[PDB]
Coordinates of C-alpha atoms in Angstrom, one line a residue:
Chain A
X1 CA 0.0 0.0 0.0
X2 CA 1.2 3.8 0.1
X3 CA 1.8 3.3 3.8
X4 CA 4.4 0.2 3.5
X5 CA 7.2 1.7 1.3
X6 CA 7.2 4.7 2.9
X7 CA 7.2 2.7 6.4
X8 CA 10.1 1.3 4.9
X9 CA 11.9 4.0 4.1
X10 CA 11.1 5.5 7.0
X11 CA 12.9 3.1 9.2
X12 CA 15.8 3.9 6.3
X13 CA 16.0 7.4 6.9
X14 CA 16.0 7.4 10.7
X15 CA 18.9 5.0 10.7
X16 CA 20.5 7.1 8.2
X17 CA 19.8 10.1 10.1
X18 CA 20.8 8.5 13.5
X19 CA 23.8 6.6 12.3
X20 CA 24.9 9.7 10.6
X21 CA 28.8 9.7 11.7
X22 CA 28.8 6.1 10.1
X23 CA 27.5 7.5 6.8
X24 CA 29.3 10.1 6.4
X25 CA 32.7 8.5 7.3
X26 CA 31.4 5.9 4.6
X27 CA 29.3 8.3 2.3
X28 CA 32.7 11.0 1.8
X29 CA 34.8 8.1 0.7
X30 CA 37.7 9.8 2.7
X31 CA 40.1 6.5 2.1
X32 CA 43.2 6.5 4.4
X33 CA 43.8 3.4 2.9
X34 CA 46.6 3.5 0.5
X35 CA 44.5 1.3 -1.6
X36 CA 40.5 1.2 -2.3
X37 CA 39.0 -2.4 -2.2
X38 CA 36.3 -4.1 -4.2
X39 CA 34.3 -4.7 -0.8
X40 CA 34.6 -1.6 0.2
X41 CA 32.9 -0.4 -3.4
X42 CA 30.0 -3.3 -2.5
X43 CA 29.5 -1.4 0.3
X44 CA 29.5 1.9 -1.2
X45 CA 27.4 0.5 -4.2
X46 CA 24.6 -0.5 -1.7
X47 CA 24.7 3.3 0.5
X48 CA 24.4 5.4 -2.6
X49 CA 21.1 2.9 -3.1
X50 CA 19.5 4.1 0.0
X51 CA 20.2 7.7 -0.3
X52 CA 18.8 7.1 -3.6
X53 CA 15.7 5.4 -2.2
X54 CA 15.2 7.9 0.8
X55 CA 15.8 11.1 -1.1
X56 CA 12.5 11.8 -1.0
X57 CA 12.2 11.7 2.9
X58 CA 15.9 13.7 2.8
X59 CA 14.1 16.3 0.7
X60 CA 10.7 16.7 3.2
X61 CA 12.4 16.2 6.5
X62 CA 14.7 19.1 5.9
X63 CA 12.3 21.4 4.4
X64 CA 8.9 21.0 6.6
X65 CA 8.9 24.3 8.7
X66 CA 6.7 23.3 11.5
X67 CA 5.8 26.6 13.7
X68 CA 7.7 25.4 16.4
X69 CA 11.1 24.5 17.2
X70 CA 13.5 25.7 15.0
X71 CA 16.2 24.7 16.7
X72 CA 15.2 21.2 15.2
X73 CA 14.4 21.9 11.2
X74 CA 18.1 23.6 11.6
X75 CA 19.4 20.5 12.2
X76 CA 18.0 18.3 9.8
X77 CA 18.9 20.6 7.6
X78 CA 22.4 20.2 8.0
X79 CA 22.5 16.7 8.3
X80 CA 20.5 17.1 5.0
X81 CA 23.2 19.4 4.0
X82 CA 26.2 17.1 5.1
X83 CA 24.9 14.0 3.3
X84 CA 24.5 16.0 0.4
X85 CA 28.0 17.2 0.4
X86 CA 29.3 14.2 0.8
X87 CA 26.5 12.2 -2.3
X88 CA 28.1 15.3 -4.7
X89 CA 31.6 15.0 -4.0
X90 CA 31.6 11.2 -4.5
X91 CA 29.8 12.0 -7.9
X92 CA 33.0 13.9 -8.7
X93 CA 35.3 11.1 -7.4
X94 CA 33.8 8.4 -9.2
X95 CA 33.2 10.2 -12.5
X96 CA 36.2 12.0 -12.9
X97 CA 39.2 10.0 -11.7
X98 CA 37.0 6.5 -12.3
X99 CA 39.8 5.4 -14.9
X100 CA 42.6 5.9 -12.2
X101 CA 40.2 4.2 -9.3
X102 CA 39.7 1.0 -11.8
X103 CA 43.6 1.2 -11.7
X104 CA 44.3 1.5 -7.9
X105 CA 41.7 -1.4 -6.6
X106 CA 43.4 -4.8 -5.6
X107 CA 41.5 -7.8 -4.8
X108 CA 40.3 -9.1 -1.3
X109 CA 40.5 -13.1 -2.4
X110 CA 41.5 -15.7 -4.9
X111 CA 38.4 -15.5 -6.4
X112 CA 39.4 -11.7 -7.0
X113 CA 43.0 -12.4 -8.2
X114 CA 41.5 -15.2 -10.8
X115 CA 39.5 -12.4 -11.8
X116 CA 42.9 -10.4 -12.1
X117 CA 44.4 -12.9 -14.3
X118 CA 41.3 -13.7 -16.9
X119 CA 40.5 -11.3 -20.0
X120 CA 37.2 -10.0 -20.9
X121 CA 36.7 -11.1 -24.5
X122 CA 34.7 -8.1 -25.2
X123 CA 36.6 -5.5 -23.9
X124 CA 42.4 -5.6 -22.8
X125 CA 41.2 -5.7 -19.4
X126 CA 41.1 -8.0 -16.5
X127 CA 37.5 -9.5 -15.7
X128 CA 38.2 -7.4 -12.1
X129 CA 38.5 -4.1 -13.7
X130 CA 35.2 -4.8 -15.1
X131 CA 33.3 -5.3 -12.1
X132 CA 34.7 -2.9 -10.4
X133 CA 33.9 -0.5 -13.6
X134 CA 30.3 -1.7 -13.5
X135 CA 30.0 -1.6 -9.3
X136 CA 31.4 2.5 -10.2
X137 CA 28.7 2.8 -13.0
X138 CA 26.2 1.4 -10.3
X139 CA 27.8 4.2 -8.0
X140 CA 27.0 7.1 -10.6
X141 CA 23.4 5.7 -11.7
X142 CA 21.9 5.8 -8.1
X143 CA 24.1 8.7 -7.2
X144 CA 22.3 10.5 -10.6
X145 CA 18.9 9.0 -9.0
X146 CA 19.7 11.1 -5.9
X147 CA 20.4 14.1 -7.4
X148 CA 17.5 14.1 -9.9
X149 CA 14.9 13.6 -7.1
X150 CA 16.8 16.0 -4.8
X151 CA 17.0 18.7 -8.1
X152 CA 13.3 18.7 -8.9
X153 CA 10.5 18.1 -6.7
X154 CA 6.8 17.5 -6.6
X155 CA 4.6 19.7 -8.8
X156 CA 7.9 20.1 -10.9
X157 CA 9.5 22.7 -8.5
X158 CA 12.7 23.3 -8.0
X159 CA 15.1 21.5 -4.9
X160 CA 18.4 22.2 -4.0
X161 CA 21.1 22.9 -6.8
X162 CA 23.6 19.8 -7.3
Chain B
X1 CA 53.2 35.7 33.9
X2 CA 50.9 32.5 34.2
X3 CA 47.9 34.1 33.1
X4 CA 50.0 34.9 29.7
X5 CA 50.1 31.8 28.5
X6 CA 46.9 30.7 29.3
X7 CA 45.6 33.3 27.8
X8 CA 47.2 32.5 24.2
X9 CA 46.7 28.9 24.8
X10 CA 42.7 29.6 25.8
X11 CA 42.1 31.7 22.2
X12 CA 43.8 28.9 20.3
X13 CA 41.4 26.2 22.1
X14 CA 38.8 28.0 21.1
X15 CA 40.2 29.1 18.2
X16 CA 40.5 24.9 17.4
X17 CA 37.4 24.2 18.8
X18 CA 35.0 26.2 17.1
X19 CA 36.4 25.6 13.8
X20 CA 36.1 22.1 14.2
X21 CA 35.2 20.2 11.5
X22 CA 37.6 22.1 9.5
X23 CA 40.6 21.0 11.9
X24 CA 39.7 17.2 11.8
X25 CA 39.2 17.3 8.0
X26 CA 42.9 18.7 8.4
X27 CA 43.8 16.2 11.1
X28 CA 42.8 12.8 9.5
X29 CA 44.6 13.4 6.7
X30 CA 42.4 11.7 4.3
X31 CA 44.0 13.2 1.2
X32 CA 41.6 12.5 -1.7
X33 CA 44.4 14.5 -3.8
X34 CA 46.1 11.3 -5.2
X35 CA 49.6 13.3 -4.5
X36 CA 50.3 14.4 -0.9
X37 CA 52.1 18.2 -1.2
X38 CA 55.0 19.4 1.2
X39 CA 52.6 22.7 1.8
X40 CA 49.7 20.3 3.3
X41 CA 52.3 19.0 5.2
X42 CA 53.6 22.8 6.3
X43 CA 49.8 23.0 7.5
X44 CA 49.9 19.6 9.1
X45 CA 53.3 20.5 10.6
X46 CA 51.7 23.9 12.5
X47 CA 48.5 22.2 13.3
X48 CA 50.4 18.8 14.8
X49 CA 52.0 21.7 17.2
X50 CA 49.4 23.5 18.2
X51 CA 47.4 20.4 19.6
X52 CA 50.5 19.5 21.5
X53 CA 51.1 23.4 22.7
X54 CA 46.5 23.0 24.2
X55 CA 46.9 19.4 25.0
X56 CA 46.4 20.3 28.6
X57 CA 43.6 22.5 27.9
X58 CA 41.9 19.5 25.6
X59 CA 42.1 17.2 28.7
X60 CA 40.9 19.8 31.5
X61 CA 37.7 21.0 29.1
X62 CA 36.8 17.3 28.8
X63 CA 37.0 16.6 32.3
X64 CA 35.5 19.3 34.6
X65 CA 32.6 18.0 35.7
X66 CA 30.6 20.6 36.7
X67 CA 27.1 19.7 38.8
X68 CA 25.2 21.6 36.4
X69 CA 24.9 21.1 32.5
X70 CA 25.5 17.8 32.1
X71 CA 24.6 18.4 28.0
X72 CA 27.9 20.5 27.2
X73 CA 30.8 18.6 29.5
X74 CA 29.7 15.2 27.1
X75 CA 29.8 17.2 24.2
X76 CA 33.9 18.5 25.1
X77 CA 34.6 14.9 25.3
X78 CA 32.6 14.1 21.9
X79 CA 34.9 16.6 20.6
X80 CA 38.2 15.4 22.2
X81 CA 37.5 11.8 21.2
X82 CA 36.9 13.1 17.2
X83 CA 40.4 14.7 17.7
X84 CA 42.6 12.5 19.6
X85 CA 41.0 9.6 16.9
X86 CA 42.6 12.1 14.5
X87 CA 46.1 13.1 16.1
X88 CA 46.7 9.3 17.0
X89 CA 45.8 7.8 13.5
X90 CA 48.3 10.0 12.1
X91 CA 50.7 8.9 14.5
X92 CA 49.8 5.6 12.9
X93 CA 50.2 7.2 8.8
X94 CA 53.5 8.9 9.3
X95 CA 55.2 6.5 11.2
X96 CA 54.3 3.4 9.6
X97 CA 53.7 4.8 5.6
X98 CA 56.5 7.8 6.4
X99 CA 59.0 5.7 3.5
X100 CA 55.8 5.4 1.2
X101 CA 54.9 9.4 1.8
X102 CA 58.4 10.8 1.2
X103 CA 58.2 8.7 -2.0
X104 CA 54.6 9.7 -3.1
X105 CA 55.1 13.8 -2.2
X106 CA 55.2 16.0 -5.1
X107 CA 57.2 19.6 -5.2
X108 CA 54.6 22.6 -6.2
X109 CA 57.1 25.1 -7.3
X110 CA 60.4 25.5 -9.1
X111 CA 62.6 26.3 -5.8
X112 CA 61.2 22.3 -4.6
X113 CA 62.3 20.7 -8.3
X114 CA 65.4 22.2 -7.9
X115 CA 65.3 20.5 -4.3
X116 CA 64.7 17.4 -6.2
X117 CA 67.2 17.9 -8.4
X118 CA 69.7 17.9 -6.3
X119 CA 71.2 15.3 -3.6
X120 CA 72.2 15.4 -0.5
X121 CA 76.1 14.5 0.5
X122 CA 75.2 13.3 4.1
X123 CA 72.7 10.4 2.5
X124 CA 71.4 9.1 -2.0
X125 CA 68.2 10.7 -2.0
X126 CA 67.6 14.3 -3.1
X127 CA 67.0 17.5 -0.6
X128 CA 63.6 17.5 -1.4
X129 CA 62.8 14.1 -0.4
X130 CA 64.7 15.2 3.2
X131 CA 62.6 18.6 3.6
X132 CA 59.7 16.1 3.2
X133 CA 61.0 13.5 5.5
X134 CA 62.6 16.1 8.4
X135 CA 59.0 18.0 8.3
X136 CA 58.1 14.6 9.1
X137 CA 60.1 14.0 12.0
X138 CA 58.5 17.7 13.3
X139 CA 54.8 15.9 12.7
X140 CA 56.1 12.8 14.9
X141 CA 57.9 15.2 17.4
X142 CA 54.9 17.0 18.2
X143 CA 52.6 14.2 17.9
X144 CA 54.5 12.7 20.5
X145 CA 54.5 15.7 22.8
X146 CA 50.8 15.5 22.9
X147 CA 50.3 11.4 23.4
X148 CA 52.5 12.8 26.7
X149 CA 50.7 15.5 27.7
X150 CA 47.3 13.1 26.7
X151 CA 48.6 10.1 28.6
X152 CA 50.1 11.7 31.8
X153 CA 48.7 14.3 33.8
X154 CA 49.7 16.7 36.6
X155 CA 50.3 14.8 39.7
X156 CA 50.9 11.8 37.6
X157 CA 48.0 10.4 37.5
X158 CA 47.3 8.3 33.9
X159 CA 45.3 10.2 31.1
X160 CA 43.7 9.0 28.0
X161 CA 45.5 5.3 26.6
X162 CA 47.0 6.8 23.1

């Protein structure tokens, strides 16, 4: 019903929103490691998904101005406006330097390195920097789902420039 | 006198603790620049030394327990956990990676290629890639001065475990 999916991504947004250190030390992909991993692009894969999904509530949440306490719409705002920070600069991560990411990955396990070793017959490249190259288009297509239900809104208004 | 340096050392507390989100995207050094710079390092090098310079601030701020606002002495220590996590993960990067970083640094002006031009008769590497190496040594210096000042307080009793 039009209850259930947005029950669901309800219970989504408010772990998002309470979680929020979590995803957005995932969610910035600020890396100290010296090398990305596929597993940690599974991950990643699976977050921009959600924000994706739960855009909608990201968008309402932090715009509702309820004549009350506005000490709280300021804050949902800015997590609304951290996230969103974080959703755009990975947009310009994994567009722009997605060649040299596809060339710094190494694999987690053997079924990774015999990945590594086997060609793609249509493309040479390894079979591994062709799942990572479709996890990073995964990346950008919900990451362009986000910002397209984030840019315009309901009634076709306007939402926050990406 | 003893108010003096107090006094300098309270304006750079909250000098570092107002602006902080912008000192721990400094102190994690999570450098999505795929070349480290020896001038983010001359910023690292300062900031490194004025964390050690407070340190004894950072522990008394998140430690008076007043019998009143019980709200803003948990939100001190939310702070001083986000940078000690910071300042002690370094201590980790540019110990442990400090090889790998003096051979990933790039120069960013013509006065640091002719630094890595030329060598050093003492070691060979070039000068540059001792500049590097010897800033360095002044991030673990004052790193190290902090852990102290972090792990052992006045009347020697045992701080925070770096």
């Amino acid at each position: 019903i039009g209850s259930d999916r947005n029950e669901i991504y309800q219970e989504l947004f408010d772990f998002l929103s309470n979680h929020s250190d979590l995803f957005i030390i995932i969610l910035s992909d600020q890396s100290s490691f010296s090398h990305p991993t596929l597993s940690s692009l599974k991950v990643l894969k699976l977050t921009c998904f959600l924000f994706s999904k739960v855009s909608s509530l990201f968008f309402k949440k932090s715009t509702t101005t309820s004549s009350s306490t506005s000490t709280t719409s300021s804050h949902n705002r800015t997590q609304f406006n951290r996230f969103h920070y974080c959703l755009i600069n990975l947009l310009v991560k994994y567009s722009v330097n997605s060649k040299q990411i596809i060339e710094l990955v190494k694999p987690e396990n053997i079924d990774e390195e015999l990945l590594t070793e086997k060609i793609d017959f249509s493309y040479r490249k390894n079979q591994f920097q062709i799942l990572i190259k479709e996890t990073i288009t995964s990346i950008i297509h919900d990451l362009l789902l986000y910002c397209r239900k984030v840019s315009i809104v309901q009634d076709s208004n306007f939402g926050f420039v990406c």
